[PDB]
Structure formats: structure tokens, C-alpha cells
Write a protein that binds this ligand. Structure first.
Ligand SMILES: Nc1ncnc2c1ncn2[C@@H]1O[C@H](COP(=O)(O)OP(=O)(O)OP(=O)(O)O)[C@@H](O)[C@H]1O
Ligand SMILES: Nc1ncnc2c1ncn2[C@@H]1O[C@H](COP(=O)(O)OP(=O)(O)O)[C@@H](O)[C@H]1O
Ligand SMILES: [Mg+2]
Lengths: 51, 384, 203
């Protein structure tokens, strides 16, 4: 019960942080870099998280 | 890196050995020179320190943009993806040799400065008209002609395989070849055999799709086709049923009959414009040659014209021999009786009769082929 | 339509499951079937059924511009749909001809000359030996074969033709029994008389 109460209390601060986009991947590149496309904008060359 | 092409001795001669030894000595001395500074005055790793600095300079996101105009002193006008364009500068590690109008370039996120240049991503067209694998077996499958095969070989294969006969006499090989004759006699088959034997990139396109549904699209397509054929390598361009653009008319065409004329003028230019043509061979084929424009076939655009006549009875027997080579044919049948089944049957009727007889025997779960199968097959295929 | 079923099975089902059976006789596998008959006699359902039972991705093209955005961005050519066909290797392409096309003028005779016909001409010209992947087939459904252009009637082009005659008394009775099952009927209909009262009709 204490754990769930603490989680509920922290949820308010957790929820305040920013959001994230959704994109479509075209094809990968060298050294952990890929090419993506976001629909109402131009395509970007981005890197990949370690996971 | 093409250090020395003069190895023409190609043997154990002392000249080649001395040249190789001197090359090795030069390479060793230059290696010592290029290593001494990394041993005495490194001042940086220079293997990954410079790379780390470069990666630190460029941001982790970088956007694509289109060049529109470039000034010599390292800056240009780049159009962003939305469309608004700027006056950014150019860095030094961008190898300013691929800078061309229209190429996608990698810009920085903050100041939009040009940091990199990007390779393109092929085209949808190239896959559509690029032949990948050799279709089937070479001239040993044709039979019957044996005369114009040498002409085709003289035009396309010999200039590439032995480019020494011509240089001794100092001539240019004949430029164009066109094949005409009645339908169903073996033109596309000869093209397939050439495609199998050849080594250059082979491009095929039919004439019925040279006509589009908008204004000015046809000339655009022709220009793109020859641009692709030019930018690869020694190549062969094959156009089939050209007359299909002058015979049938479609209501889907936005223009009338004049845009056909515009496409024709574009094609004539591409065959014999005043630009340097390069190294491209053209093969054309049709069965109604009395309709197309005589200005399209003049010498200097098409130099060879080959007629395919109807098969003769010797060639008829040879064709029947070819097309039942692997068929479990019974001993009762005889090809002579089938030879004059029709007075003027062409090459395709032979294969049609053979395949239909095979199917009819397949129905009864059999292996051999009898006379009555052939007798009914000819009626099925010929008399409707 | 049993005989038509057998005829289409010999040129669709067999050269997928047992190619070696065709290789035993050393003849090329057929690729072209053409169905002809009056409208409403059951051609399209038959193509759908045979594609369903053989487990082939049934694709059809009508040349509309709504669907064009899926095929490609501009699609100057038409062969580009193969780029999507070979990913579902056992596939079948279907094409239908409008009920009204004449030879004098107006529809068919004038204005346009082919539409669907030029599409099959291009397609068959493609997979005549230049195509690497196998297991692709083409079908049409037209009436009055006499109006087809000569380039499509060459003996070596189309592998099989099948005719769909208008139903006789027995066929009408069977179709009626098939389609009356969906309704709440009554004991005793004697629908033989119903079939006998309809003559020279379609299915
Ligand atoms: N001389 C020949 N030798 C061997 N086979 C032949 C010959 N002529 C015709 N055939 C057979 O007939 C078929 C028809 O060949 P193909 O369609 O390439 O002929 P074509 O005359 O160039 O045709 P089209 O004029 O209709 O474009 C060949 O695939 C082959 O099976
Ligand atoms: N032989 C038949 N048996 C049962 N139902 C049929 C038969 N022929 C047609 N139908 C029904 O009538 C409709 C006719 O459409 P369709 O057969 O697709 O026309 P077409 O074949 O001329 O394109 C079909 O949807 C089917 O439901
Ligand atoms: Mg041909």
C-alpha cells in the first residue's frame, strides 16, 4: 500500500515532462545512425538509443 | 590506387622485378616519413581525436535541404524542406566536389550551415527497365536463320569483344540496327539471345508506353531514358513495336496527334543530336515498317536493316526437331506429315501445336504422345 | 460450371503444386487464360474462387486514380505493380473489360482502342522470358472475342480460351436452388415450374 501511494504521489511530477514525436523510418546508415521522416516536415538523420 | 600500370613485361624479367623493388622501397620510405611525425610530434591522436572534434562540431540532428545556387567563396542558397531558403556558409570538411544544383545536403540544426552532402536513393524507373538475369540459352536454340545472326554479331558483340579489328583499318562500327518482317518469326527471340550472351547493361522498353496522358510528358520520359542509359556504362537499348505509336490511338491522350509528333522529334534528336553521344547501341524491331517516318531511319541513325522471311521446309523440320527434343515421343508419329499441315505456317505455330498436344496427353494421365493427339491439336490451334 | 472448373484447374492449380509433372513432358507452363461470355454468367466469381482455393493473393487492376497513390508517386509506366506482386509470390492479376465496346465507332471502335487490351499486351510482353520470379498469372473476362485486336490473337500468346454459354434449364434450376437457401421458405415450392417459366435468361 505504501508503494502504491508513493507512486501515485510521484505521478503528478512525472506527467509534467514533455512528449515525443512519431515518425517513419526510411533506411539505416553506418555507425548507429538512421534516416527518419516526420509527416508534416522534412526527413531527418538521427541516432539510436543504446537499448 | 593505380600506382603503376606499366607491368607489360608480365613475366620474371629483371625490369618488372626492379620496378617492383623500387616501388616497395619508395612505399617504405614514405611510410617512415608519414610515421615519424606521429612518433615525434603527435600533438593529437589524429585517428579519432579529429573525428571526435568533427562530431562535436556538428549537432546530433541534421536536416536535409536542396541547393539552388552556390557562390565560389564557400557559401550558397539552400532551400529548407518547408520552402523558405537562407544564405548559409559552407564548412571545410564537406569535400566541395559533389556540390551540384539539386542534391540533398545535410544542414546543421541551429545555423543551417552546410555540414555534409548526401548520396541519392536510386530511382523507381531504373528497376522498371533494368534487365537483371540472362533469360535463356544462346544462339544454339534458334536454328533456321544462321544468316543475320552473323550480322547482329558484327554490330553489337564484335565491337566490344575484339576492339582491335576496327582500329587496324580505322573505322567506326555501324551504328544502328533494325529488324523487320511478318509477325511471329523470331525477332524478340534473337534479342533474348543477345541479352543472354552480352555483358553490358540491357534496357528494354515497349513502344506502346511511349505515349502518356498529359502534355509534355513524352519528351521528358525519352530524355530520362537516354540519361539513365548514358550514365551507367556501355549499354544496349532495345525498343520493341515502335509502330504501335503510329497505328493505335487512345482517347486517354490529352493532346491529339501533334504530341505524337513532338515525341517523334525528341526521339530523332536523341538518336542524332549535336551532343556527344558516347557509347550506346540501339536495337529496334517492328512488323509494319512501311508506316514510320523515313527521317527516323536514315543512315547515320539506323545503318542496318534485317529482314526475317517465312520459314522454309528444311527450317520447319529443324524447328520440329528442336521443340520435341525432351518430349517422350512415341515411334508412331512422323514429322513429315505435319510439315505441310498448313501451307505457310510460321515459327509460333510449331510451339503452339507441341504444347497443346502435350497438354492433351497430360489430361489422360499418360506419358507418350500418339498421332490422334497431334491430329486434334492442329485442329484446335489452327481452325477456329 | 463443372467443365469450366476442370479446364481452369488444369492451367492454374497444377503448375504450382507439381511443376515437375509439367517438366516430365518438357513443355513450358502456361501463363495466359481468357474467359469469354455474356455478362452476368459467372466469370469473376470463378476467378475469385480458384484464387481462394489455391491460396493466391488475388490482385485486380482497373486503372483508376484513387488507388494510384498506393502503387507509386507518379507511376509513369504501368509495370511498377510487379514491385508489389513478387513479394506475395503466388499471385494472380485480374482484368475486366467494359460491357460496351464496339468496332464501328463510339466505345471501343472510336475514341480509345484498347485500354485493358494494351495493359495485357504490356504485361504478357514482360513475363515472356524476361521475368525471373515464377508463379504469376493473368486473366481476362470479355464478351465477343471477335473484336480483340490481332496482336492478341497470335497462336503463341494466349494459352487457353474458355466460353461461358447462357444457362440451360438444369443450370437455371441449380442456381435457383443455391440462391433460395438464404430465405425462409415454405413446404413445397415445385420450383421446377419456376425455372421452366423463365427462358433465355442469365444467371
Ligand atoms: N526461327 C525460330 N527458331 C526457333 N523458334 C522459333 C523461331 N521462330 C519462331 N519460334 C518460336 O515462336 C516463338 C515466337 O517468338 P517471338 O515472339 O520472339 O517472335 P517474333 O516474330 O519476334 O514476334 P513478334 O513479331 O510478335 O514480336 C518463339 O518463342 C519460339 O518458340
Ligand atoms: N453460375 C452461377 N451460379 C450461382 N450464382 C451466380 C452464377 N453466375 C452469377 N451468379 C450470381 O450473379 C452475380 C453475377 O455477377 P458476375 O458473375 O460477377 O458477373 P460477370 O461474371 O459477368 O462479371 C454474381 O455475383 C453471383 O452472385
Ligand atoms: Mg516481339
Amino acid at each position: 500500500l505504501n508503494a502504491k501511494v508513493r507512486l501515485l504521489r510521484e505521478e503528478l511530477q512525472l506527467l509534467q515532462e514533455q512528449g515525443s514525436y512519431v515518425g517513419e523510418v526510411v533506411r539505416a546508415m553506418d555507425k548507429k545512425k538512421v534516416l527518419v521522416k516526420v509527416h508534416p516536415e522534412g526527413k531527418f538523420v538521427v541516432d539510436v538509443d543504446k537499448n | 590506387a593505380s600506382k603503376l600500370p606499366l607491368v607489360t613485361p608480365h613475366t620474371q624479367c629483371r625490369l618488372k622485378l626492379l620496378k617492383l623493388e623500387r616501388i616497395k622501397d619508395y612505399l617504405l620510405m614514405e611510410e617512415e616519413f608519414i610515421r615519424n611525425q606521429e612518433q615525434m610530434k603527435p600533438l593529437e591522436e589524429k585517428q579519432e581525436e579529429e573525428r571526435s572534434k568533427v562530431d562535436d562540431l556538428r549537432g546530433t540532428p541534421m536536416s536535409v535541404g536542396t541547393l539552388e545556387e552556390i557562390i565560389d567563396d564557400n557559401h550558397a542558397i539552400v532551400s529548407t524542406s518547408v520552402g523558405s531558403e537562407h544564405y548559409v556558409s559552407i564548412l571545410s570538411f564537406v569535400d566541395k566536389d559533389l556540390l551540384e544544383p539539386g542534391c540533398s545536403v545535410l544542414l546543421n540544426h541551429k545555423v543551417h550551415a552546410v555540414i555534409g552532402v548526401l548520396m541519392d536513393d536510386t530511382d523507381p524507373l531504373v528497376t522498371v527497365m533494368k534487365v537483371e538475369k540472362a533469360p535463356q540459352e544462346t544462339y544454339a536454340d534458334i536454328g533456321g536463320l544462321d544468316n543475320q545472326i552473323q550480322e547482329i554479331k558484327e554490330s553489337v558483340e564484335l565491337p566490344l569483344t575484339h576492339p582491335e579489328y576496327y582500329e587496324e583499318m580505322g573505322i567506326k562500327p555501324p551504328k544502328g540496327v533494325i529488324l523487320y518482317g511478318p509477325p511471329g518469326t523470331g525477332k524478340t527471340l534473337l534479342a533474348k539471345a543477345v541479352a543472354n550472351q552480352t555483358s553490358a547493361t540491357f534496357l528494354r522498353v515497349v513502344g506502346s508506353e511511349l505515349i502518356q496522358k498529359y502534355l509534355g510528358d513524352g519528351p521528358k520520359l525519352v530524355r530520362e531514358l537516354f540519361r539513365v542509359a548514358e550514365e551507367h556504362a556501355p549499354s544496349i537499348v532495345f525498343i520493341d513495336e515502335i509502330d504501335a505509336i503510329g497505328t493505335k490511338r487512345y482517347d486517354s491522350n490529352s493532346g491529339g496527334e501533334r504530341e505524337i509528333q513532338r515525341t517523334m522529334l525528341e526521339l530523332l534528336n536523341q538518336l542524332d543530336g549535336f551532343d556527344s553521344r558516347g557509347d550506346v547501341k540501339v536495337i529496334m524491331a517492328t512488323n509494319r515498317i512501311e508506316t514510320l517516318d523515313p527521317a527516323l531511319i536514315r543512315p547515320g541513325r539506323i545503318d542496318r536493316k534485317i529482314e526475317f522471311p517465312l520459314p522454309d521446309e528444311k527450317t520447319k523440320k529443324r524447328i520440329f526437331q528442336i521443340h520435341t527434343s525432351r518430349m517422350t515421343l512415341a515411334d508412331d508419329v512422323t514429322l513429315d506429315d505435319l510439315i505441310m499441315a498448313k501451307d505457310d505456317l510460321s515459327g509460333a505455330d510449331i510451339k503452339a501445336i507441341c504444347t497443346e498436344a502435350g497438354l492433351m496427353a497430360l489430361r489422360e494421365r499418360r506419358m507418350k504422345v500418339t498421332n490422334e493427339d497431334f491430329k486434334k491439336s492442329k485442329e484446335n490451334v489452327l481452325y477456329k | 460450371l463443372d467443365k469450366q472448373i476442370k479446364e481452369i484447374k488444369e492451367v492454374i492449380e497444377l503448375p504450382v503444386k507439381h511443376p515437375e509433372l509439367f517438366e516430365a513432358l518438357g513443355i513450358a507452363q502456361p501463363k495466359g487464360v481468357l474467359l469469354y461470355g455474356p455478362p452476368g454468367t459467372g466469370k469473376t466469381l470463378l476467378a475469385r474462387a480458384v484464387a481462394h482455393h489455391t491460396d493466391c493473393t488475388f490482385i485486380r487492376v482497373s486503372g483508376s486514380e484513387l488507388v494510384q497513390k498506393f502503387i507509386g508517386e507518379g507511376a509513369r509506366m504501368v509495370r511498377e505493380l510487379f514491385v508489389m506482386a513478387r513479394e506475395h509470390a503466388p499471385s494472380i492479376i485480374f482484368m475486366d473489360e467494359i460491357d460496351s465496346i464496339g468496332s464501328s465507332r463510339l466505345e471501343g471502335g472510336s475514341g480509345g482502342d484498347s485500354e485493358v487490351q494494351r495493359t495485357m499486351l504490356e504485361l504478357l510482353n514482360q513475363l515472356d522470358g524476361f521475368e525471373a520470379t515464377k508463379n504469376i498469372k493473368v486473366i481476362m473476362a470479355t464478351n465477343r472475342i471477335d473484336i480483340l485486336d490481332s496482336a492478341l490473337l497470335r497462336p503463341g500468346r494466349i494459352d487457353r480460351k474458355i466460353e461461358f454459354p447462357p444457362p440451360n434449364e438444369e443450370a437455371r434450376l441449380d442456381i435457383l436452388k443455391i440462391h433460395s437457401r438464404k430465405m425462409n421458405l415454405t413446404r413445397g415450392i415445385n420450383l421446377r415450374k419456376i425455372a421452366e417459366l423463365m427462358p433465355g435468361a442469365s444467371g
